[PDB]
Amino acid sequence: SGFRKMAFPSGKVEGCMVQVTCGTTTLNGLWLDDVVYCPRHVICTSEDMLNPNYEDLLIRKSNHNFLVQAGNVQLRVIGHSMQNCVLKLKVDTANPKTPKYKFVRIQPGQTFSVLACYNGSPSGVYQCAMRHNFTIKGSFLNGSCGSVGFNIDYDCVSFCYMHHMVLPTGVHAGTDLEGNFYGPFVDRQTAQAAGTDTTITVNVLAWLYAAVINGDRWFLNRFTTTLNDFNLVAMKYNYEPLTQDHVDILGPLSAQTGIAVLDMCASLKELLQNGMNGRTILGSALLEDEFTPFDVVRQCSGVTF
Amino acid sequence: SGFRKMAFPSGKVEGCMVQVTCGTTTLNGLWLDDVVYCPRHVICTSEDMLNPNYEDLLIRKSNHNFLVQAGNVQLRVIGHSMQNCVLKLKVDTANPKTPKYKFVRIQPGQTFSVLACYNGSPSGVYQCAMRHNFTIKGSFLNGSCGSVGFNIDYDCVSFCYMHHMVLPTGVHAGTDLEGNFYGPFVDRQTAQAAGTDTTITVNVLAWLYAAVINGDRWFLNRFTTTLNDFNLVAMKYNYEPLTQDHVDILGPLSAQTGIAVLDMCASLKELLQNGMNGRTILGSALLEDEFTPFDVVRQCSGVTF
Ligand SMILES: *[C@H](O)[C@H](C[C@@H]1CCNC1=O)NC(=O)[C@H](CC(C)C)NC(=O)OCc1ccccc1
Ligand SMILES: *[C@H](O)[C@H](C[C@@H]1CCNC1=O)NC(=O)[C@H](CC(C)C)NC(=O)OCc1ccccc1
């Protein structure tokens, strides 16, 4: 079977990427129906981004100050509005490639596929996870703002993320498609700090079940533990405490493998207290937390979209 | 900037995936122009795959024994031929989504994007590398044969791989788009063995340059070495010996970072002899070899397609 970090097919999202220019700044936009979405710091100069009054900066902008290009075609902007931290440019033409789509705000631990773009052209795709402190470890350069993160449920494209900025620690932050930032961040060039990032515990547990499926079992110990005792060990190691909801999610994996949920927590307790001793699990020398329980069954059962 | 394992946008390849049925076996096909490509073991039963006379098995097959479905549409097969290990089904309709494409046979160490499919529908995309023994560590289930590996150069899709089988050691093997197998493998259910897999040395060296670009430098030692002396250390550690061609490829990275090529080899010699001591490089506790020097500059300069 094998296990790789997989992303959804980006075919539907590529047809919705446009180039947005306003003055001397250019970023990518999401063209769905007759509305174009993009970050609001496109109306900023290099000196504006230090500290911006986006309201005052937007007063000085009309419809013709926005250059929207769809490939080699130009879209005529007939209206603009600021919803939180995103612009909504009203164009006179509907996108003929608009798929079944919907806007969703995700929770920490959930995974999505990012389509990194520059000048409105797709450059690549990779898998990411909303971390505990509402940041991601993405791959973004200058001009990548407007790149979107999404999930695919058969033919429906659930858009959940749009890139905005990078933090001093190299991690990235962004908003949903309504403009609300994931985390306590703001769109300014100010030293901002993400808080303490704890490991998604349920994601590591689901990843261990994927290892048992593909043959890695050296870590299966024959011990048990309680949630209250395992959580007290997980708190020393900066891990998410486990709830009954996390156990119920890992139910299908617990029944498919015949390994109890609390039994797997005992193996994770030993992996934290004893390290790994130079071994690997699924080809990795670290506990991997980018994989939701749905990501494990989707790859171990072959769901098509 | 960040550094992730990135794959090309799969938008152009999704429109070329069809479902091919022959008797009781169904796999995926590559529909370019008026020709459909697919593995030849589709004309096999479960008992045939033990030891197959593909010539005798193909004599008993006519044009109407092949069911080709493009989404909800059926393509009429008007001809068939066996080129090595792939079938070439002649359909009466050209694919209106055919991109600029070309067939290429790649060398060990080169990377490509795999679009895993089932029933002709894309399920996901990930990055792979042709290993030293002409195998890959992919993610394939039953029915994934016909999934293709490709690279994208702006608008040209270079197809290089088509899945066929999995080995006893969980690794996978396949052919190019002409039917010739990468490696000494054959399309039979026989115990087959891949040889000794050595680490792509130039790929690890280019990955270390990507670490210096993004800020990881704890491994920069202030030693030097010769190629003849570094290769003798690399031979003990099952690494590819280094040539002047590998040095010339790492030239641009060597000039961009100001770190000499032979200087970086001295740091890799220390990383092999001393281990990693619980540290990480770009978030990994292992030396990563899935990244060609082109993959590093494409992600560190933001090339668009
Ligand atoms: C949008 O294209 C860009 C993406 C950045 C550039 C490098 N990596 C990224 O993810 N975002 C910005 O340039 C952004 C603009 C603000 C008005 C939101 N600023 C930014 O990310 O600068 C980095 C930084 C800002 C403040 C403190 C420390 C670093
Ligand atoms: C094609 O759909 C399929 C993909 C396999 C199934 C599981 N993982 C994969 O990559 N290929 C085969 O089923 C293939 C058929 C031969 C006629 C080429 N056989 C195969 O991969 O079986 C595994 C195996 C064969 C021989 C020795 C040990 C294992």
Numbering used by the authors:
A (entry chain A), B (entry chain A): 1 to 305
Question: Would you copy out the relevant sentences from the publication that reported this structure?
Answer:
Paxlovid targets the viral protease nsp5, also known as the main protease (Mpro) or 3-chymotrypsin-like protease (3CLpro). Nsp5 cleaves the viral polyproteins at 11 sites, releasing nsp4 through nsp16. It contains a catalytic dyad Cys145-His41 that bears similarities to that of chymotrypsin. Because nsp5 is enzymatically active only as a dimer, studying the monomer-dimer equilibrium is essential for understanding the full effect of mutations and inhibitors on nsp5 activity.
To study the effects of E166V on the structural interactions of nsp5 with the inhibitors, we solved the crystal structures of E166V-nsp5BA.1 in complex with either NIR or GC376 and compared them to existing WT-nsp5BA.1 complexes. When crystallized in complex with E166V-nsp5BA.1, GC376 forms a covalent bond with Cys145; to relieve potential steric interactions with the β-branched, bulky, and inflexible Val166, its benzyl group assumes multiple conformations through strategic repositioning from its location in the WT-nsp5BA.1 active site. However, in all E166V structures reported here, the N terminus changes orientation as Val166 cannot form a hydrogen bond with Ser1′. In contrast, E166V-nsp5BA.1 only showed this tight binding with GC376, not NIR. With GC376, E166V-nsp5BA.1 markedly shifted to a mostly dimeric population, similar to WT-nsp5BA. In contrast, the addition of GC376 caused significant shifts in Ti for both WT-nsp5BA.1 and E166V-nsp5BA.1 proteins. However, GC376 still inhibits E166V-nsp5WA1 and E166V-nsp5BA.1 with similar IC50 values as the respective WT-nsp5 proteins. Hence, the strategic torsional flexibility of GC376 allows it to avoid steric conflict and structurally adapt in a changing pocket, enabling covalent binding, inhibition of E166V-nsp5, and evasion of resistance.
